[PDB]
Symmetry: C2
Subunit: 220 residues, 2 copies
C-alpha cells in the first residue's frame, strides 16, 4: 500500500505521483480557462483531493502555473537555438524551425501553447519568460530577414507557426505523437506557408532533411 492517510476519492488523473496528477489537472484547466479564473478548488476537485491537500505539493497556485509554463517555453526556446545554427540556407533553416515548433506544439497532451499567450504572463512577475519568448521571436524574424530583407513580412512566419495553437485539440489526446520517421501534415503546411508568404521556393528534400536536424539536435 501507499504511505499517508488515504484520500477521500480515488485518483482521477494520469500521473506516477501527485505532482504529475496536479500538473495534469492544472494544464487542462489553465489552457481552457486561463489562470485567474481557475480556482484551487476546481484543481483539487479535478485531481480528486481536498483543496488544502494541494499545498503539501506546491506552495502556491502561481507555482503550479510557473511549472507548466517552464515545461513548454524551455524546450521550444532551446530547440530554436540548437537548430538556428546549422549547415543549410535560411530558407531551409526557417522551414525546419517552423516544422519543429509545430511538431512540438502538437506533441503535448494538452494545448500548452495557449499558456504563453495568456494575460497573467504580461505582468512583470513573469519576466524570465517574456525574455525567452522574445528571444525565440527574434530568431524567426532574423531568419526571415535573411530571405526578404528589412520588410514587415519578416514578422509573419512566427505568427503562422503559433497558429497551430488555434487549430489543435485540447482534450488530453495527443494529436500527433513524436516520430523520428515523419513530420505531422500540419507542420508541413505551416512551414510551406511560412515560405510562401516570404515568396521563396521550398527547399530541397525538406522533410527528409528536417528529420536529420532533429536527430542531430536530439543527440546534442
Amino acid at each position: 500500500g501507499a504511505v499517508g492517510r488515504p484520500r477521500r476519492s480515488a485518483p482521477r488523473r494520469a500521473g506516477k505521483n501527485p505532482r504529475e496528477e496536479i500538473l495534469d489537472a492544472s494544464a487542462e484547466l489553465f489552457t481552457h480557462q486561463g489562470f485567474a479564473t481557475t480556482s484551487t478548488h476546481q484543481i483539487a476537485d479535478a485531481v480528486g483531493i481536498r483543496q488544502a491537500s494541494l499545498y503539501y505539493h506546491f506552495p502556491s497556485k502561481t507555482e503550479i502555473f510557473l511549472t507548466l509554463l517552464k515545461s513548454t517555453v524551455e524546450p521550444s526556446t532551446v530547440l530554436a537555438e540548437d537548430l538556428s545554427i546549422l549547415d543549410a540556407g535560411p530558407e531551409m533553416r526557417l522551414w525546419a524551425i517552423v516544422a519543429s515548433e509545430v511538431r512540438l506544439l502538437l506533441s503535448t497532451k494538452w494545448n500548452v501553447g495557449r499558456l504563453y499567450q495568456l494575460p497573467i504572463v504580461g505582468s512583470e512577475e513573469f519576466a524570465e519568460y517574456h525574455s525567452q519568448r522574445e528571444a525565440l521571436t527574434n530568431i524567426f524574424r532574423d531568419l526571415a530577414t535573411e530571405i526578404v530583407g528589412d520588410d514587415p513580412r519578416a514578422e509573419l512566419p512566427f505568427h503562422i507557426t503559433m497558429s497551430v495553437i488555434e487549430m489543435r485539440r485540447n482534450d488530453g489526446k495527443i494529436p500527433s505523437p513524436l516520430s523520428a520517421d515523419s513530420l505531422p501534415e500540419t507542420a508541413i503546411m505551416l512551414a510551406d506557408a511560412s515560405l510562401a508568404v516570404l515568396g521563396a521556393s521550398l527547399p530541397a528534400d525538406r522533410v527528409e532533411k528536417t528529420l536529420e536536424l532533429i536527430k542531430q539536435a536530439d543527440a546534442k
Copy 2:
C-alpha cells in the same frame, strides 16, 4: 463644455458616462483580461466609486459582453456583405482580409485581444460565440472556393487575426479610418493570405477594395 478640458478632469473618453466605462474597460480587459480586472479598478479609471457602475450596467459580465458585441457585429456585417458581392473568390477574400485588418486597426484599444480571451465559455456567451464562428466560416468558405478541400483553408483567418500582435494598445489609434487608404499592414496580411493559398494577386486589389467599402458604407 466650451474650451479645452482640464488635465485633472476624468481621463476617460466618450459622449456620455456609460461610454466612459467601456473606454476604461477596454483598456483593462485587453491588458489584464476579464477576471483579473476588478470593478473597483474600472471605477477608479472612470474616476468614480465602485458601486456606481451598477446604475449603468447590471454586471461586470454585461460590460464585457457589450464590448464584445460592439466589435464583432461591425465585422460580421462587413464580411457578410463583401462575401456575396460580384467579384472573384481571390478578390473577395483579399477585400475581407484587408478590411477586417483595417477595422481591427481602427479602434482605440486593441479589442481583438478580447477574442483570444478564454472567458467566453458561459451559456450566455453563446450569442457572441456562434457569431464568432459564423465570421470564421465566411473565411474558411472563401478560402475553400480558391483551393478546394485543403487544410490551408484555415490559414487566411489566422493570418488576418495576427494583426492583434502587431498593433499598439496604449490609447493612440494605430491607423485611423480613411476612404482613400488601406494601412500597410492590411495590405501585407491580405497579400499573405492569398500567397499561402497559391492564388494570383488581383492587379488593382487595393483600389477595388476601397471602392467596395464606399459602396458598402452607403
